[model samples]
Target: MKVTIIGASGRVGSATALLLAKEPFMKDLVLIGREHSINKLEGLREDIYDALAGTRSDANIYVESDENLRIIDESDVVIITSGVPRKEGMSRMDLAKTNAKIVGKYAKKIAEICDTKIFVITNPVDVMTYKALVDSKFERNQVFGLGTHLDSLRFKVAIAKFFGVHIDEVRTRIIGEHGDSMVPLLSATSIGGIPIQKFERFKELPIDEIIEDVKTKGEQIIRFGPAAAILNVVRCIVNNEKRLLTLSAYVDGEFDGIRDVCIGVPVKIGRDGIEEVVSIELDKDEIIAFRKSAEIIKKYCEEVKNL
Candidate 1:
């Protein structure tokens, strides 16, 4: 399968490129960047090729910096990680204005070129994903964002530490916006096949504290988290795993009364993209918090409507 990474010169994009290069199913790995970053992309391509040589992997790597994006045509997946990075103390929402413009430009260009699935990883990803969907005019299933998949990982880590259990024993999800308003699905949390509320010692765990940590973990330390989360999604699509995952998908009428927005929610992903948006019961408070999260993303979407 052919996978393309736009803005592959940046940290997240380059990391994703290296990981994808190691995938045995990946036949072509295209790294794209702006004209100014052509040198960096070339260096990245060569570095990945060198690593692949050592591993005896033979994934062909291609580098391009053309604005027309002719090389991205006929790709199986095109991940967009090209945008401004969030500065210290800056909220993901704060980067929406600048990043939305960049997302819109590429979204339109890519739509004109190919029918590949889009995975957006730009900052303010929830809003950027919405921008890409609207600008590309692609089906909702064809475009999504990294969203709370990373946050869910942090959530699982915190829960595992609190319960003194393996990470695999903690099953939870973080939905809604990939920001301050993100909703942790405490109602659906399970520990070793038992509901968290029913699990022993649940009362002693600091639920609010754990949620806070998951929300801020990105600002504390960031890297491979996004690359790994993205790779998992790619694997599902390539192998038609149909595994449930939390992603920023365009929802018309899912999760309470929320509609017409791109927000994090549980979805079954496969070769056809979002095969299903899974519905899970939420408590009263969880419902209210989720709606609030949707409101924040909708507000940002409105701000970028004209762009």
Candidate 2:
């Protein structure tokens, strides 16, 4: 499948481009970046092309700095990591207003060139995802952001570490915004197919500590911004994995009385994009927490609309 990355020079975008280049599933890789950085992207493609050559593969690489998005035509998956990233001491929401305007223009250009699935990775992803949806006028399912899938990994890691078990053995999810208000779904979590609440050492464990870890851990490793987790979302798309992952999508009337805003929730992602939005049961407290998170994202979504 063809995968085009819009901010190909950024750290997360470059990391994912290089990683996906090594994978055999992707037949075409297109790199799009700023006008003056075309030369750098040319060299970036050269460096990655040689690595694929060392592994004896022939994935075609295309680099373009076109404001027209002409080089990204007929793409199957468009990965958008464009816009200013959050600097040290800046929250994701702090980057929203700047990135909102940045993402809308590109979203319109890409929409004109190709009607494809877009994976938004811009900061304040919930806001940017909605802006892209508005600018592109695409179906809600066709545009989404890489939100809780990254947070879910943190939860998985935190859960596994607390239990001293393998990461794969711990099944958990973090829903709502990909920010301070994210809800760790302990009521729905499990370790090795056993519900976390029923585990022998459940009460003795510090659940609050792990929840805090999930919220702040990204700041500690923000340079890459969860490339592995983001690429796994791509893998699920290209390979038709149909994996159930937590990602942000527009809600018509899904959970917590939210409608017409993008927020992170459980979704089945496959080749078709957002195959199904799974409405997992939330307890009363979880329901309250998720509603609050949804409201926070809605406030930002409104700002992006006004932008």
Candidate 3:
């Protein structure tokens, strides 16, 4: 399988390439990092070369050109990691204007040149994913941003820690925006198909508290945010497992048919792309909170004239 990554120079972009290099299923890997990320690309390639030096070596790396549109044409998957990293304590949407321009350029190229590939957004997760949708004018299913997958990863970790279960046995999802507006469905967040409430001893988490705690969890990983997020996304794509995770995608009027609004919800993610979206029941208050979150995404989308 041919895989191409844009913004390969950034930490997230490079780390994604490195991680895929370690995967047993990966065949040929292509890197399309920024033109200026020379040192960064070399650093990433060195890591890959070291790992694959005496092993089966079929990895290829290339610096991306803003002036050329053909690089995207050759790959099966194009990951857009070409956005600025969010600052500590800042909202993910704060970098909307600039990164929208950054991702929008690739959106145009990918939309035109390479029509069959899957585009994954790993920058500022939520907002930039929305920008990619508008910039590309591609179908909603074709674009996905790794939204609460990181939060879901964190959620499972904390649950495993609390209940003394293996991390593999824990399961959950953090949905909504990959920002302050994220929503955690306490009822549906479960582990091993058993709702957290059934734990008896540990007790399921409260919605309000889970919202508050997990909402700002990204801030805790501020120093290591972007790179880590990209690696997680690569894990999903490399496997093509069709995992149902919270990711930012275009809302086709679901939840009042909200359109052009990109927010995180449960989506069936696999090799072809986001196959289906599954939404859970929410209370009146939860609906209000979700609407408020949707408004924020709409506002950011408008800032880039994304809609």
Candidate 4:
């Protein structure tokens, strides 16, 4: 797989590049970012190559500045981590207008030079993914974002910690927006095949704290390096893992009162990109919360369309 990581100088992009360079399936790893940051970018390129050499991985790494987007051509997959992170006191939606322009600008450049599966990692990903889709004119399946997948991981981790169970033993799904509007279907959560509400040990768990923690966890980690979760998304793509994950993608009424807007929901990721958008039942409260979340995304999506 020839994978390209844009915005390679940033913490998340550089971290993801290091992981991608180690994959045996990774034939070529391209790092694209700003010209002003070329020195640091070159340093990252060198480090990843050194790591790959130490591991005896045969993957070749290349770094490019956006001054020449031609390097983005001929890749099997492109993971975009470009755009500004949310500043303190900023909502994901607050980043939307500026980041939509950023994502759209890059998507147009990518469309001109390449025709590859694009996975967006920018903030307010649902809206930005929609911008990429419209700006690049790629089929919905050809483009999406990694939002809910990371959020789902956060949700699962919170549950596992509270219950003192293995993270894999916790099964949960978060739907709707990638931000505060995201709806966690607690009614559908399970541990070791037992529904949460049915478990006798749940009475003492601080479920509210877990939910709050999941919602606000990003604030605690923004100052650090990027999450390892982004690389897991890359693995699924290159290896065709076909794992069922929740992330932001275009929706066409899978959930009630939502259509044509990009929002977080369950999807199957594989070598072909988003192979399937899975639909699962939600309780009455979940149904209402999901619709509200869809509205949140829908409201912002309209802004992008207008932009």
Candidate 5:
């Protein structure tokens, strides 16, 4: 399977490209980024290729600035890691308009030459991804952001570290907006087939911390910047883990007519992009939070379309 990584010069882009280098299914890995980043981007690929030495995984770097990234129609997995990261206090919605225009341009291009599985990793992901879902006009099942998948990963990692258990033992997802408005379903989270909170592993220190961490931890990473956890994202894509993540996509009334609003939810990612958007039922609290986050995206999408 041929794979292309956009924004290859960025920290996450480079990390994702580097990780995909080791995948057995990866037939060709093309790195795409800005024109100015060409030299810097190619240098990074050269370094990785040197590390691979005589391995077949060795691949060449293609500068997106050269227009090569746009013309290729055979790429099976096209991961777009372009656009700006989050600001300190700015929410995911903050990056929507500016980044949407950027991603939308690529989405239109993708629709023209390559109609394939696409993974979008821009900030304000829920809305932007949704925008791509509409702009690319791909099947709803085929288009989804790598949204809450990373958030969910962080959630499990934090829980596992606290409970002295394997990360696999934890089951959870950050649903709703990939921003300040996200909701974490603590009721669904489990550790080894049993509820962690039900077992009283976590005392009543703060029922709210879970939501806060899942929502804003991206900002904390922004404070440190430079693309962390990219390998984990790459693993899900390369291995076809069918890992469910909250990515931006058009919701086809799955949750009470919630359409075209990008939010984090369960997803099964593999060779064919987003295989399925795993829907969930929310409790009263989850319902309210879900509506609020969805509205935030809905409002923006309306505003942009009008412009």
Candidate 6:
């Protein structure tokens, strides 16, 4: 399957490109960037070629700049990682308006050319995902953002570390805004098939501290986390794994009356994008926190609505 990465010159985009280039199922990989970054993309392409030389991978790489996004035609999946990166100490919402416009422009263009799945990685991703969906006018199932998938990964790591278990032994998720207001599903978390609260070491776990750590850790190294998360999602799509992942999806009355907003929630992702929005029982406090997170995202979405 052919997958395209927009803003492939950026750190996250380039990292994702490198990872995807090595995937066995990746038949074609298109890397697109701004005209000014064409040289960078060219160099990146050569590096990817060198990296793949003599390896089992034989994925074809195509390079293009924003001026010629027509290269994205027929792509099975289109990832928009293009936009201003969040600076240290700045909230993601601070980049909302500018990135929304960039994401919306490409979303509209991509919609006109193809009906491929669209993955938004732009900052304030929930808002940008909303912008992409509205501007492209694509089915909600066909477009989504790399929202709390990474956050959920972080949560899993924290739980595993706290309980001294393998990462896979912990099942956890972080939903809602992918920001300070994200809701960690403590009620849903489990360790080796036992609920977290029922775990022997639960009393010793610093729940509040772990949640804060997951929220703030992104500022230290944002690129690789997102790159890894995107690769996982792309794999699910390319292989039709239909894995349940926490991602930013437009929700209409899915959780505690939340509707008309793109926020992080559990979804079944397959080749056709989100196949199902899974419902999980939330504690009263978690439900309240989730709605509050949605409100924060909605405020940012409103600010960029006219863009």
* TM-score for each predicted model, relative to the true structure: 0.95, 0.94, 0.85, 0.93, 0.86, 0.95
How well is each residue in 107-181 modelled by candidate 2, as lDDT tens digits?
A: 888888879988899878888999999999998889999878878877777778878998789998888888888
After TM-score superposition, the amount by which residue 89's alpha carbon in candidate 2 deviates from its true location, in angstroms, is: 6.5
Residue 92 CA displacement from its true place in model 1, Å:
5.6
Over the stretch 1-307, how does candidate 6's per-residue lDDT look in tens digits?
8999998999889999998998888999999888899899999999999999998887899988787567888999999999987776765656888798899999998988888889999888899999999999999999999999988888788788878889888998989987889998989898888898886688888878888888778534442467778889988998899898999999988776788899999999998899989987899999999989998888888888779
**Residue range 71-140, candidate 1, lDDT tens digits:** 9988999999999887777765567888999999999999899888999999789999999999999998
* TM-score, cand. 1 vs. native: 0.95
lDDT (C-alpha, whole model) for all candidates:
0.88, 0.84, 0.70, 0.81, 0.69, 0.88
Off by over 4 Å in 5: 54-60, 66-70, 87-94, 202-205, 219-240
lDDT, candidate 3, 1-307, per-residue tens: 5667787776666767777677666666667755676676777777788887887766565555556757656566677777777656665456777687888777787778877544556555666777787777777788888777777766666667777888888777766778787766656756677877677854554445655666766535642454566555556665787777777777876777456677888887776677778766776666777888888778877887642
lDDT of 1 at 47: 86
Error of 2 at 255 (Å): 1.1
Q: What is the C-alpha RMSD of each candidate to the true structure, in Å?
A: 1.7, 2.0, 3.2, 2.3, 3.2, 1.9
Candidate 5 per-residue C-alpha lDDT over 75-119 given as tens digits, one digit per residue, 9 for 90 to 100: 776777788876667654556777888777777778888777677
Rank order (by TM-score, best first): 1, 6, 2, 4, 5, 3
Candidate 6, residue 31: how far the Cα is off, in Å: 0.9
Model 4 Cα lDDT, one tens digit per residue, 82-123? 999877887666689889888999888899997888889888
- Report the poorest 10 consecutive residues by lDDT, candidate 6: 218-227
Stretches of model 1 off by over 4 angstroms after superposition: 88-94, 219-224
What is residue 249's positional error in candidate 3, in angstroms?
1.2
The RMSD (Cα, Å) of candidate 6 is 1.9
lDDT of 6: 0.88
In angstroms, the error of model 6 at 260 is 0.4
